[PDB]
Amino acid sequence: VYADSFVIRGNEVSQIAPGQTGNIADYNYKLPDDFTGCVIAWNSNKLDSKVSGNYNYLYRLFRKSKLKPFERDISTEIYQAGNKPCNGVAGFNCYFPL
Amino acid sequence: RFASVYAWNRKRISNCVADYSVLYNFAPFFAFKCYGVSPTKLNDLCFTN
C-alpha cells in the first residue's frame, strides 16, 4: 500500500484522475491509466491559512517534457524560452518554474 | 482584434511550411485539447487543407 499526501486548490481537485490533462495533472503529478486505489480530499482553509498568507506551497508551471506517471521532478532549472541562452539570469524569457 | 462569437473569422491555410512550435510563444495555454491527433506527433505529419 502506498499513500501520497499533499495540498492543492479546489479548482484542480477534479484533475487528480486517470486519463486527465492540465497543469497539476501534467507538470506536478500524473496517475497511470490503469491506476487502482482511492482518493480523499477534505477542506482545510480554516486551520491551514494565514491572514497575510502562506507561501510555503509552490507548484510547477513550466516543464520541457511530459511527466511520466509516479516521477518526482524536484529540479530548480531555469526555463529556456525565446532565443537567449540563459546561464542562470532568471530574467525575461527565462521564468521561475515554481 | 478578434471577431464576435456568432460570426467567427474563418481562414484557410494554403500550401506553406508549418512549424508547430512558434505557437508555443504563448505561455498559458489554458486548454490544448487535441482530439483527432496526438499533439506530440503534430510536427511529423502532412495535411490536405
Curated annotation (Swiss-Prot), chain B:
Job description of the protein: Attaches the virion to the cell membrane by interacting with host receptor, initiating the infection. The major receptor is host ACE2. When S2/S2' has been cleaved, binding to the receptor triggers direct fusion at the cell membrane. When S2/S2' has not been cleaved, binding to the receptor results in internalization of the virus by endocytosis using host TFRC and GRM2 and leading to fusion of the virion membrane with the host endosomal membrane. Alternatively, may use NRP1/NRP2 and integrin as entry receptors.
Assembly: Binds to host ACE2. RBD also interacts with the N-linked glycan on 'Asn-90' of ACE2. Cleavage of S generates a polybasic C-terminal sequence on S1 that binds to host Neuropilin-1 (NRP1) and Neuropilin-2 (NRP2) receptors. Interacts with host integrin alpha-5/beta-1 (ITGA5:ITGB1) and with ACE2 in complex with integrin alpha-5/beta-1 (ITGA5:ITGB1). May interact via cytoplasmic c-terminus with M protein. May interact (via N-terminus) with host bilirubin and biliverdin, thereby preventing antibody binding to the SARS-CoV-2 spike NTD via an allosteric mechanism.
The protein's name in its UniProt record: Spike protein S1
